[PDB]
Amino acid sequence: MASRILLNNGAKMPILGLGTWKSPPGQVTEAVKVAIDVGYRHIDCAHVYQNENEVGVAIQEKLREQVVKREELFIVSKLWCTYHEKGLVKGACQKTLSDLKLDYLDLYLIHWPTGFKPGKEFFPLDESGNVVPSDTNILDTWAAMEELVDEGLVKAIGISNFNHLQVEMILNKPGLKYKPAVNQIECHPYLTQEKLIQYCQSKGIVVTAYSPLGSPDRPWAKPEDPSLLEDPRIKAIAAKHNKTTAQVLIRFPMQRNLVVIPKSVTPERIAENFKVFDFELSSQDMTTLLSYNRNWRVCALLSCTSHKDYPFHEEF
Numbered sequence: 001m002a003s004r005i006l007l008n009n010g011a012k013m014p015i016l017g018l019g020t021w022k023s024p025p026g027q028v029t030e031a032v033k034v035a036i037d038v039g040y041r042h043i044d045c046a047h048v049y050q051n052e053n054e055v056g057v058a059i060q061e062k063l064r065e066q067v068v069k070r071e072e073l074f075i076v077s078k079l080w081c082t083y084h085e086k087g088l089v090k091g092a093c094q095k096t097l098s099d100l101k102l103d104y105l106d107l108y109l110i111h112w113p114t115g116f117k118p119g120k121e122f123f124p125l126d127e128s129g130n131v132v133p134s135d136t137n138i139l140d141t142w143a144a145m146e147e148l149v150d151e152g153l154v155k156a157i158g159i160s161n162f163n164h165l166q167v168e169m170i171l172n173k174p175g176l177k178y179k180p181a182v183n184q185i186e187c188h189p190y191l192t193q194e195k196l197i198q199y200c201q202s203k204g205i206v207v208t209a210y211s212p213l214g215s216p217d218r219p220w221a222k223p224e225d226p227s228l229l230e231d232p233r234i235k236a237i238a239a240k241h242n243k244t245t246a247q248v249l250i251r252f253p254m255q256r257n258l259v260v261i262p263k264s265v266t267p268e269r270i271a272e273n274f275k276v277f278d279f280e281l282s283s284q285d286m287t288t289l290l291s292y293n294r295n296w297r298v299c300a301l302l303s304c305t306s307h308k309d310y311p312f313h314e315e316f
């Protein structure tokens, strides 16, 4: 298992990164410092997570300490849905850069295919509770992302939560200048994503798996929901390999040629989650984990199911 995967922009991306959604602002600086200290070189960020300033403090301090060099880090962020208009994309990227205290991003993603009305609210609502769309289409947002590459703000651009027809729309965009480098999607043994992964990989797009542990801290979790970390079948595979269940859940996507971005703010777990380059799941283990698919999503964007670009009505 090599530590990095080659992207279609010619750059290499670390296959293991640290997630930061829900990482409290008073804990995420130390989480990222610990992560870098114990070997992480890839941090997954987003403006909508409301903690990029604090992530940036950690990055800057580790650069200043010369624990790492900037070229060794791979920093990812994402354009929120209220910034899909062409006149807002650069400023949204620039706010992220200024918060992260960087002069470029390694990768900048369209966070969701759905554009929303611009304004202060991340989920602008009508009086009846529907999220108010933007009319700016996907393809025009992509052209604005391409301009960030040409301005030196970002090394690579990509997409997140795009279904295969939406990926295809960009690949088929008239005048396409840069292909997506990455599609970041939810993926774990309960949502195995074979069809969409195969499609993306066949086009040279690298897939990043988010919520690989099943996001036990997601704010809408219900007691009766399935739990990957507590699934006795996964625990058994972990025991056979003398690893933790989380370590198996992280190694699983790695062996599918995916990038994976587990989140933790717990120092012990941050270190645990990185010790996944010292064992191999068998093909039988992999197929067994794949067999647990139930099409179960952490992140279904349930407030946006009527948006024209809602991604999850299509099979994949």
Ligand SMILES: NC(=O)c1ccc[n+]([C@@H]2O[C@H](COP(=O)([O-])OP(=O)(O)OC[C@H]3O[C@@H](n4cnc5c(N)ncnc54)[C@H](OP(=O)(O)O)[C@@H]3O)[C@@H](O)[C@H]2O)c1
Binding pocket: 018, 019, 020, 021, 022, 044, 045, 111, 160, 161, 184, 185, 209, 210, 211, 212, 213, 214, 215, 216, 217, 229, 244, 246, 247, 261, 262, 263, 264, 265, 266, 269, 270, 272, 273, 298, 299
């Ligand atoms: N593009 C998108 O739309 C999108 C959507 C979802 C997620 N993401 C990205 O993907 C990242 C990961 O997904 P996620 O945050 O939803 O969830 P996750 O990584 O599947 O799970 C995070 C949870 O697992 C716990 N945990 C971590 N390591 C553990 C271990 N070794 N043992 C036991 N529990 C452990 C964490 O607890 P502690 O933190 O308390 O240790 C936290 O509660 C996000 O943070 C974000 O960066 C992107």
Ligand SMILES: O=C(O)COc1cc(F)ccc1C(=O)NCC1CC1
Binding pocket: 021, 048, 049, 122, 298, 299, 300, 301, 302
């Ligand atoms: O957007 C994400 O990557 C993860 O969070 C979501 C996932 C959903 F299925 C639905 C909504 C959110 C959400 O409110 N996002 C904005 C701030 C919470 C970060």
